[PDB]
Design an enzyme around this catalytic site. Structure first.
Site, PDB file in Angstrom:
ATOM      1  N   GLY A 182      77.945 -21.261 -55.744  1.00 19.04           N
ATOM      2  CA  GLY A 182      78.113 -21.806 -56.720  1.00 19.04           C
ATOM      3  C   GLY A 182      78.734 -22.826 -57.118  1.00 19.04           C
ATOM      4  N   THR A 183      77.593 -24.002 -58.052  1.00 20.05           N
ATOM      5  CA  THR A 183      78.649 -25.597 -58.302  1.00 20.05           C
ATOM      6  C   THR A 183      79.750 -25.766 -58.995  1.00 20.05           C
ATOM      7  OG1 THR A 183      76.602 -25.066 -60.025  1.00 20.05           O
ATOM      8  CG2 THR A 183      76.677 -26.790 -57.888  1.00 20.05           C
ATOM      9  N   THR A 184      80.395 -26.436 -58.846  1.00 20.61           N
ATOM     10  CA  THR A 184      82.101 -26.863 -59.859  1.00 20.61           C
ATOM     11  C   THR A 184      81.651 -26.655 -61.023  1.00 20.61           C
ATOM     12  OG1 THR A 184      81.864 -28.412 -57.948  1.00 20.61           O
ATOM     13  CG2 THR A 184      83.411 -29.137 -60.376  1.00 20.61           C
ATOM     14  N   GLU A 232      78.761 -28.787 -63.668  1.00 23.22           N
ATOM     15  CA  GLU A 232      77.355 -29.410 -62.785  1.00 23.22           C
ATOM     16  C   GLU A 232      76.184 -28.799 -62.784  1.00 23.22           C
ATOM     17  OE1 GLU A 232      75.838 -30.326 -58.073  1.00 23.22           O
ATOM     18  OE2 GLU A 232      77.792 -31.432 -58.962  1.00 23.22           O
TER      19      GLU A 232
END
Lengths: 242, 231, 241, 204, 250, 240, 102, 243, 244
Positions: free
Chosen positions: H29-31, H46
């Protein structure tokens, strides 16, 4: 083998596959469905003269217009039969209306395919897994005669003729060409006897073969055995004429 | 290895091997394509028979007046979920004078799934549903995964030979979004999308059964003459 | 083989889960020193330096359970936070029943029983923390009780938990054996704290600052944790002595 | 009002010296209808005697129960129940059903095995220990006997002087009460011999 | 052992001798020495305090924990387990016997109760038996002074003279030759100290040796003058000074 | 299981619990059922050669269910105990509720259902018991004979043998008992039953129990003198 | 005292023709000697050319009607889009009522 | 060993293996980041547009809970949604009993106990997510991130998802610039630069920027998203500096 | 895959007869010998105490002799701990029957019940069969004296005479020789003490390591009277045989 959670890398549950193996072991049951009626025949099976062929039964009326045959694991089928009877009489109370053969099957599949070693949304009273086939046949008003194949792997399929048990492999191929839309009653009777004979070693005679039918007018009717005897005899005359 | 016999132990991968195996029933499932315009949303699905004599068995279940789904993967797991979407719709209407939103449906479905893989035993799921519905913001298409991951797309395909349908959606996004207020031109579009997945099969009324729900149309399952024009 | 690992009985007579639990404690690298003062009970413990954690004034480790009762943790934070809640539930129960908050010994005793139960439970594993309860009881006075993973508790004239606990244990021992009194004679809670700071510095052989210590003081009628600056005020007086 | 008053009937116990008497009427009637002239009310589990008044079904169900509980005791403890122990047990068991109460007045009587004392005690409906050595009196005619015995009372009697006293008291009280009549039975327990006596009375 | 029939304890071990019980025995043994001598007008039970830091207040460890005010118990084995067992044992003692007979249990009855619990605690596939063996000393007038051993299997037996802990071998032999039941309680208190020296002497201050007697009634521990019938606790706890004095009267 | 999944369905599709149940039965004693045209005879092997027992007090393998129903069994004796009582409950339930005598057929279902239900339930097993359920239904001169197996199903039989030496014993029955001629007289039926037993029991009055049921709720145990009468007559025919 | 079950009057009339059926109701809804509403509907179409009105106590009316609509909706759903006939509706209602006879 | 076979077993390592595997999941998973302002809090995320088919700004990670608590998660996506839904239940009960929208240090406390309970119980597998959450309540601005250890702490800035190395490195500067943090408006621009810098480790598919805030000054003490023009001005600044 | 028959006796043995049941027979054989002789004139139950040495006061010990009823008593052999739970169960059921019908429960009925409980353990879950065997001495009014023994399996059988536990074989064969249907009470008492002596390595076989009891109809008016012989009355019987 493996858990209800456990899924195969094939995709399908382990339990389900093992269940298919049993059906072959169970009795040969063949149906042909026609619009004047469905005809069902089963090898009742003798194995000793001591055994009393007549006393045992393999076709059982669940309703006054719906009969059922079992092939597979006969231990499991006691429950199945009792659930079915209950379901049919529930609808007859509530709505006072023809027992749709479709609706009866749908009730059956909630009960059958709900195994689990503990569920938290659903009552578990099953562990494993109802590996039994039923050919569920009858008439229901709206849509005429129906014949379903009740399947432990999932959604039932409607059929126009189906063959299960030990003699399935040979029968089923035969049924592709010979099933046609010009089988009247008279023909359908004869044909089931024909297939049954060729594919089973057990000699076709009435003491170990039996026929049944559904005519809406008279309801699901299990035939007297004298009737059955005459038909086996006409068959022999035509096989020996050709 | 012990992590695909459990469902209570984190794999080293980080996500259960069991959840990945489950996915595979989906690909063994019937090839079904789903796509939408803002106005209408269409599912086109292949029905599968089990014998020549066997009739085709419907692979689109009507949930409600304004909703239905198409399924690919395990049938047992399906029965439970079909009832749960009816339970949700019936509640929202009776209680709040409001039909269910597709936005809401997906989220409640995520949580329930996730709770049953987390606990010992229970029922993990092995079925993907592509659910269409008509809500306030018009027709939408949601993708349900048995993993419990929900995304709203304007187009996806699950099943086998998803490569050809995938190319179709990717091309015709820009052309179909623009096409609006036309249920008919959009239904036609779905039959053309499925043509690419199929190889060496007749496209006939018997094979294909098409569903639509949108602003104009309630949920209707089209068969026979109803799909004959668009083939 | 299988039973050794899990919490059901081992051939040994002493479960390996208890041993493993003590190993987990020393990972955090947290010293304590706890003494009995004349009217007070003094606890100090090693404060992790705040990176940006919580308020940098107090990166919490000593938790005011109630009036008088305070609790220091050595060992894992998840289990710390669990422990603290269970202790607060217990204090309310006792209060309702008897009208007073738990005396310090009784409360150590209550927690003992619950850790031990937990090992008989196959699926559940016991605590990983070492909890030093400290209080000034009204009828028992100054009180220290250290309760272990094992389910075993005992009282203390003084105590140290951590990896370098032994160095603190030696220093204290000689002082209280010479002095022939098991408390600090000082009446003023300020002076008790001041004594304790000095001993800590010396024992571990390193200076300390405000951000390296967290101090809780228990006196009659209350428990309270000093300001960041209050710990510094005390520290200074020793310093320019 | 109370169901115990509809069947009537009395129990009375007195002390002597190292000897006890405990006596009752054998009349059980249900109001008008005299049913039995021989319905017992005093029962024994060994030497601890249990006299029971009131409501008739309740008598039988509780005699069977108290049979039940002292049978458990004799095997566990491996020794005969005591008068004392039994008293405490009876009370507790009547308070168990505080609501839907028991509609009985039991009397515990005995001679202690180890101490040799004559002992008696009484209980209310929902059960309490009532000590009073001289007599414990019960039943619809409880007042009649309270006064009657206290005027006649002379302490720690010999077996033979005691027999006379309890006989005289039971006899006149009964005839001055409608629901008590027909026969009598008296247990004079000398120390551990039991002489068991049916008295003659002018039956009406 | 550590069988597949021992991963869960519901099931029978191949040898016809439960796994777990043998493990419990080990625990008791490794435990520190305690011993019990039944005398005509007493029971003397004696133990050493478990060795701990001298900072630790070992006063707080009371090896000898009463079940009821006139009946006490001593152990060898796992300390944690012992406090937990003791809490259960206390509750059942009052509930089953003081609310329907208004009084303390007879020694025999109470002993029976503890023994049952331990069996039930091995049947389940979860619960494990306590790490200890008890010696239960009490008194009553119906069945005299008494001393028993209760095992972690869940069964109880009476003992004229018994010992548990690691020094049990040394102690039993000595007891047999030096003492006979004919000797009084008084005599026995000396003997018991001397047997506890055999195990390991050192420091023998009453600050680390714990001695209790169950004997004559304590008018001081009745706590109220009352009726003349009532008797104080048969149990009496000694102070460290008296223990110290028998070394000077040994 | 802590995390052992104990689920069982077998890769051959028929659970192992049913399979092993069949062995358990075989080890147990032999029991035979042979019906005439007017009686049902149940022959069962008793262990009686064994050291010092008193046969009277020893609970008989035939157990009266009802006043027209009996039950005999093969396998473990322990397993069998619980069933006796369940079956007894049912005999008065049926009479209570439908207000008609027990049907020999109805009752068999109940007996079957217990073992069967337990195939399809966690924590419970099929019982290791095969049984012979026989009697004469009231107001009928039809004899009734069934055999039920651990799986939890039944079949009706002119004659059948369960437990040890099932093939050997059945071989004698095939040739010497027939569906085409079942014994007309009761006495003759006892005689052929006894003859089978000698093969596997070899005499011993106590060792052989024969219980005859005759129409209309008359259940009678065969006299020790008559058992002996039969044996002797056979031993003469062997000389010839 | 919370009055167990109210009242709201009005009058309904069902007449069975021989190719038609009429069910009529007045729009006057009253409580006591107030008019709650001079105009209020109370004859509701539940689908499949069946009309229902449950006249008397409005709460008991409303709640029954809803549970009836649900029953029609889920019958079709479960019976693959098949008409609920008038006699099966009658029977069904009977059971709801009997279930709330207690 | 019995450590691999089952969750929540003391191992000599001090932690069961299952806790270690979990940590790896969290990163996936994204930041997502959090920044505590001098007035508020700023949450900035993000959102990877996977495909064109994937619809813009509708599949949003951020969910609003109460009216004053912004919640966002990275890790196992279904575990985290299921978690927000659980925390809602915790939140509702609190508001019945006590008649107050739940304070943040209290809210943290409840959630923490739940995760911890599953790391003592084998039968219930832990969570596999780091939840950055908070907002503005009575006791002012607050910012907690909750580890799957079940431990939680407050933070002046915090970071989760794959870009976490970069995000932490950057954060040190915001502290040099102002140790109480940037005023809410300013902070958003600088937050946007952090997201793009974390986008180099997530440059495989393009993205769409989403920032939200709960701040007393300009958000009304309630959580609302940065939208429109305020968003666009941030969009331009980040593009201009990454060049 | 596998992961079965590691928690439950529900899963059937490869063997077909539970493995778990067999382990139970073994427990019973580490325990001492108990002797039942059934006679019309009475029953004797005499057993060697498992307990040993003078260090344990064995005279005091009561650990194998229990009355359920005032007519029925048991000689118990196998696990002492398991037995205790079972003695209490028996008393509760028996005494409930006594309330219901105000009639001594028949011996055969009582034993049947307890056998159903033994069976319950194995049929359901993974609970162990209790590794205890009892000899029941009992008098029913119809059938006179009745002697049973019950297995840990869950079944009971009647016996003219029986030996159980340790040295089963040796005891039985002696018992067969001297066996009489007209066996006196007197004679039955003696017979056991010789048999016990030959099966134990103690020839004298002290009174304090001997448990003896006799259920006698020799008592007043043909009435069943249970007479536990105190250790001092055993002691007199030692001298009579002259083995002391």
């Amino acid at each position: 083998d493996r858990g209800v959670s456990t899924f195969s890398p094939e995709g399908r549950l382990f339990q389900v596959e093992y269940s298919l193996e049993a059906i072959k072991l169970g009795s040969t049951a063949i149906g042909i469905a026609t619009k004047e009626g469905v005809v069902l025949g089963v090898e009742k099976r003798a194995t000793s003269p001591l055994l009393e062929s007549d006393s045992i039964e393999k076709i059982v009326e669940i309703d006054r217009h719906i009969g059922c045959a079992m092939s597979g694991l006969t231990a499991d089928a006691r429950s199945m039969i009792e659930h079915a009877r209950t379901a049919a009489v529930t609808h007859n109370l509530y709505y006072d209306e023809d027992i749709n053969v479709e609706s009866l099957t749908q009730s059956v599949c909630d009960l059958a395919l709900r195994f689990g070693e503990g569920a938290s949304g659903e009552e578990r009273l099953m562990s494993r897994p109802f590996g039994v086939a039923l050919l569920i046949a009858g008439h229901d008003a709206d849509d005429g005669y129906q014949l379903f194949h009740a399947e432990p792997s999932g959604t039932f399929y409607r059929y126009n003729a189906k063959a299960i048990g030990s003699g399935s492999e040979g029968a089923q191929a035969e049924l592709l060409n010979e099933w046609h839309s010009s089988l009247t009653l008279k023909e359908a009777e004869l044909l089931v006897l024909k297939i049954l004979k060729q594919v089973m070693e057990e000699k076709l005679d009435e003491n170990n073969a039996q026929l049944s039918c559904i005519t809406k007018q008279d309801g699901f009717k299990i035939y007297d055995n004298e009737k059955t005897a005459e038909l086996i005899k006409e068959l022999k005359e035509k096989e020996a004429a050709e | 290895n012990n992590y695909d016999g459990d469902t209570v132990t984190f794999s080293p991968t980080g996500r259960l091997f069991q959840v990945e195996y489950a996915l595979e029933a989906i690909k063994q499932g019937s090839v079904t394509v789903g796509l939408r315009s803002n106005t209408h949303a269409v599912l086109v699905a292949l029905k599968r028979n089990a014998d020549e004599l066997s009739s085709y068995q419907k692979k689109i279940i009507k949930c409600d007046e304004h909703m239905g789904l198409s399924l690919a993967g395990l049938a047992p797991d399906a029965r439970v979920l079909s009832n749960y979407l009816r339970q949700q719709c019936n509640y929202s209407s009776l209680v709040f004078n409001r039909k269910l939103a597709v936005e809401r449906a997906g989220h409640l479905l995520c949580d329930k799934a996730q709770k049953n893989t987390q606990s010992y035993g229970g029922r993990p799921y092995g079925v993907g549903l592509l659910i269409i519905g008509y809500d306030k913001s018009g027709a939408h298409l949601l993708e349900f995964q048995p993993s419990g991951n929900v995304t709203e797309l304007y187009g996806t395909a699950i099943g086998a030979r998803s490569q050809g349908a995938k190319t179709y959606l990717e091309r015709t996004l820009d052309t179909f979004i623009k096409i609006d207020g036309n249920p008919d031109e959009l239904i036609k579009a779905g039959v053309e999308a499925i043509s690419q997945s199929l190889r060496d099969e007749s496209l006939t009324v018997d094979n294909l059964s098409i569903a639509i729900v949108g602003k104009d149309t309630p949920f209707t399952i089209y068969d026979g003459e109803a799909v004959a024009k668009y083939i | 083989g299988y039973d050794r690992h899990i919490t059901i009985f081992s051939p040994e007579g002493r479960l390996y889960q208890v041993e493993y639990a003590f190993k987990a404690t020393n990972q955090t690298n947290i010293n304590s020193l706890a003494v009995r003062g004349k009217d007070c009970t003094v606890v100090i413990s090693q404060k992790k330096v705040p990176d940006k954690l919580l308020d940098p004034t107090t990166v919490s480790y000593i938790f005011c359970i109630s009036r008088t009762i305070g609790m220091v943790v050595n060992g894992p934070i998840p289990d710390a936070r669990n422990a603290a809640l269970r202790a607060k539930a217990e204090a309310a129960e006792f209060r309702y029943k008897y009208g007073y908050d738990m005396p310090c010994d009784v409360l150590a005793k209550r927690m003992a029983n619950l850790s031990q139960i937990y090992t008989q439970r196959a699926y559940m594993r016991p605590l990983g923390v070492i909890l030093t309860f400290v209080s000034v009881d009204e009828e028992l006075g100054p009180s220290i009780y250290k309760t272990d993973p094992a389910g075993y508790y005992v009282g203390y004239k003084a105590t140290a938990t951590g990896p370098k606990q032994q160095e603190i244990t030696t220093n204290l021992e000689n002082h209280f054996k010479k002095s022939k009194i098991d408390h600090i004679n000082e009446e003023s809670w300020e002076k008790v704290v001041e004594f304790a700071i000095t001993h800590m510095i010396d024992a571990l052989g390193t200076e300390f600052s405000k951000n390296d210590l967290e101090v809780g003081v228990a006196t009659k009628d209350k428990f309270f944790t000093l300001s960041a600056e209050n710990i510094e005020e005390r520290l200074v007086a020793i310093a320019e002595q | 009002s109370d169901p115990s008053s509809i069947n009537g009937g009395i129990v009375v116990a007195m002390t002597g010296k190292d000897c006890v008497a405990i006596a009752c009427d054998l009349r059980l009637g249900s109001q008008s209808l005299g049913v039995s002239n021989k319905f017992e009310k005093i029962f024994h589990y060994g030497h601890v005697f249990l006299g029971i008044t009131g409501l008739a079904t309740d008598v039988t169900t509780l005699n069977e129960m108290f049979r039940y509980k002292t049978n458990l005791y004799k095997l566990k403890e491996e020794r005969a129940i005591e008068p004392e122990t039994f008293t405490q047990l009876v009370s507790s068991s009547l308070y168990e059903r505080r609501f839907g109460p028991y509609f009985v007045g039991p009397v515990v009587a005995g001679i202690n095995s180890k101490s040799g004392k004559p002992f008696i005690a009484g209980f209310d409906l929902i059960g309490c220990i009532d000590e009073a050595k001289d007599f414990i009196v019960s039943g619809t005619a409880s007042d009649q006997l309270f006064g009657m015995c206290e005027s006649l009372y002379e302490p720690n009697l010999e077996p033979e002087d005691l027999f006379e006293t309890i006989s005289q008291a039971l006899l006149n009280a009964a005839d001055r009460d409608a629901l008590s009549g027909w026969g009598a039975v008296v247990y004079i327990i000398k120390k551990d011999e039991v002489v068991k006596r049916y008295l003659k009375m002018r039956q009406d | 052992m550590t069988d597949r029939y021992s991963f869960s304890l519901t099931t029978f071990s191949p040898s016809g001798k439960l796994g777990q019980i043998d493990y419990a025995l080990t625990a008791v043994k490794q435990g520190v020495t305690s011993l019990g001598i039944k005398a005509t007008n007493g029971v003397v039970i004696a133990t050493e305090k478990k060795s701990s830091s001298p900072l630790a207040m070992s006063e707080t460890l009371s090896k000898v924990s009463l079940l009821t005010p006139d009946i006490g118990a001593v152990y060898s084995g796992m300390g944690p387990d012992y406090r937990v067992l003791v809490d259960k044992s206390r509750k059942v003692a009052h509930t089953s016997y003081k609310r329907i007979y208004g009084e303390y249990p007879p020694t025999k009855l109470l002993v029976s109760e503890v023994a049952k619990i331990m069996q039930e605690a091995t049947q389940s596939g979860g619960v494990r038996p306590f790490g200890v063996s008890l010696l239960i000393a009490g008194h009553d007038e119906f069945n005299g002074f008494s001393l028993y051993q209760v095992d972690p299997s869940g069964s109880y037996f009476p003992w004229k003279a018994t010992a548990i802990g690691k020094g049990s071998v040394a102690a039993k032999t000595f007891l047999e030759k030096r003492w006979n039941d004919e000797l009084e309680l008084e005599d026995a208190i000396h003997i018991a100290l001397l047997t506890l020296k055999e195990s390991v002497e050192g420091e023998f201050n009453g600050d680390t040796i714990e001695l209790a007697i169950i004997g004559d009634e304590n008018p001081d521990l009745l706590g109220y003058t009352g009726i003349p019938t009532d008797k104080g606790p048969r149990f009496r706890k000694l102070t460290s000074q008296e223990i110290n004095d028998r070394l000077e009267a040994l | 299981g802590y995390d052992r999944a104990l689920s069982i369905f077998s890769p051959d599709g028929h659970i192992f619990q049913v399979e092993y149940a069949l062995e358990a039965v075989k080890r147990g004693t032999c029991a035979v059922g042979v019906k005439g045209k007017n009686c049902v005879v149940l022959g069962c092997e008793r262990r009686s050669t064994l050291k010092l027992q008193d046969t009277r007090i020893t609970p008989s393998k035939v157990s009266k269910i009802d006043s027209h129903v009996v039950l005999s069994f093969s396998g473990l004796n322990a397993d069998s105990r619980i069933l006796i009582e369940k079956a007894r409950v049912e005999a008065q339930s049926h009479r209570l509720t439908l207000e008609d005598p027990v049907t020999v057929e109805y009752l068999t279902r109940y007996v079957a259902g217990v073992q069967q239900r337990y195939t399809q339930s966690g924590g419970v097993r099929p019982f290791g018991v095969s049984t012979l359920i026989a009697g004469f239904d009231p107001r009928d001169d039809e004899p009734k004979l069934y055999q039920t197996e651990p799986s939890g199903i039944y079949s009706s039989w002119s004659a059948q043998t369960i437990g040890r030496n099932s093939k050997t014993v059945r071989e004698f029955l095939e040739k010497n008992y027939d569906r085409k001629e079942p014994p007309a007289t009761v006495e003759e039926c006892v005689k052929l039953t006894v003859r089978s037993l000698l093969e596997v029991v070899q005499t011993g009055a106590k060792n052989i129990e024969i219980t005859v049921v005759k129409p209309d709720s008359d259940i009678v145990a065969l006299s020790s003198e008559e058992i002996n009468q039969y044996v002797t007559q056979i031993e003469q025919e062997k000389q010839e | 005292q919370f009055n167990p079950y109210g009242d709201n009057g009005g009058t309904i009339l069902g007449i069975a023709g021989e190719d038609f059926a009429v069910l009529a109701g007045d729009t006057r809804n009253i409580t006591d000697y107030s008019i709650n509403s001079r105009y209020e509907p109370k004859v509701f179409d539940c689908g499949d050319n069946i009309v229902m009105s449950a006249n008397g106590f409005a709460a008991d009316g409303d709640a029954l009607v809803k549970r009836f609509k649900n029953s029609v909706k889920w019958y079709h759903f479960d019976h693959n889009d098949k008409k609920l006939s008038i006699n099966s509706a009658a029977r069904n209602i009977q059971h709801l009522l009997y279930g709330k006879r207690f | 060993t019995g450590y691999d076979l089952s969750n929540s077993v003391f191992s000599p390592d001090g932690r069961n293996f299952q806790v270690e595997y979990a940590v790896k999941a969290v990163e996936n998973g994204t930041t997502s980041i959090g920044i505590k302002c001098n007035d508020g809090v700023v949450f900035a995320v993000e959102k990877l547009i996977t495909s064109k088919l994937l619809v813009p700004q509708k599949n949003v990670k951020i969910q609003v809970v109460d009216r004053h608590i912004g919640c966002v998660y990275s890790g196992l996506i279904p575990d985290g949604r299921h978690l927000v839904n659980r925390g809602r239940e915790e939140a509702a009960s609190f508001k019945k009993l006590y008649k107050t929208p739940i304070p943040i240090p209290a809210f943290a406390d409840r959630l923490g106990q739940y995760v911890q309970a599953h790391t003592l119980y084998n039968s219930v597998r832990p969570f596999g997510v780091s939840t950055i959450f908070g907002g503005v309540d009575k006791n002012g601005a607050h910012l907690y991130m909750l580890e799957p250890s079940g431990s939680y702490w407050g933070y002046k800035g915090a970071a989760t998802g794959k870009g976490r190395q970069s995000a932490k490195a950057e954060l040190e500067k915001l502290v040099d610039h102002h140790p109480e943090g940037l005023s809410a408006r300013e902070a958003v621009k600088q937050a946007a630069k952090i997201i793009y810098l974390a986008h180099e480790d997530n440059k495989e598919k393009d993205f769409e920027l989403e920032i939200s805030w709960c701040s007393l000054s300009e958000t009304n003490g309630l959580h609302k998203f940065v939208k429109g023009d305020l968003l666009q001005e941030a969009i331009d600044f980040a593009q201009k500096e990454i060049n | 895959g596998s992961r079965r028959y590691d928690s439950r006796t529900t899963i059937f043995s490869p063997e077909g007869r539970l493995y778990q049941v067999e382990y139970a027979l073994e427990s019973i054989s580490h325990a001492g010998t108990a002797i039942g002789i059934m006679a019309s004139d009475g029953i004797v139950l005499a057993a060697e105490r498992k307990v040993t040495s003078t260090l344990l006061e064995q005279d005091t010990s009561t650990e194998k002799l229990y009355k359920l009823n005032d007519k029925i008593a048991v000689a118990v052999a196998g696990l002492t701990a398991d037995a205790e739970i079972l003695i209490n169960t028996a008393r509760i059921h028996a005494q409930n029957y006594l309330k219901t019908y105000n009639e001594d429960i028949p011996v055969e009925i009582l034993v049947r019940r307890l056998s159903d409980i033994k069976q319950g353990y194995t049929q359901h879950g993974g609970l162990r069969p209790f590794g205890v065997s009892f000899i029941y001495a009992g008098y029913d009014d119809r059938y006179g004296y009745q002697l049973y023994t019950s297995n840990p399996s869950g079944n009971y059988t009647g016996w003219k005479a029986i030996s159980v536990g340790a040295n089963t074989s040796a005891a039985q064969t002696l018992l067969q020789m001297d066996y009489k249907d007209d066996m006196k009470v007197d004679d039955a008492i003696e017979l056991a003490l010789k048999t016990l002596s030959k099966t134990t390595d103690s020839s004298a076989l002290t009174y304090d390591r001997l448990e003896f009891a006799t259920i006698r109809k020799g008592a007043n008016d043909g009435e069943v009277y249970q007479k536990i012989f105190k250790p001092q009355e055993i002691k007199d019987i030692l001298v009579k045989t002259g083995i002391t």
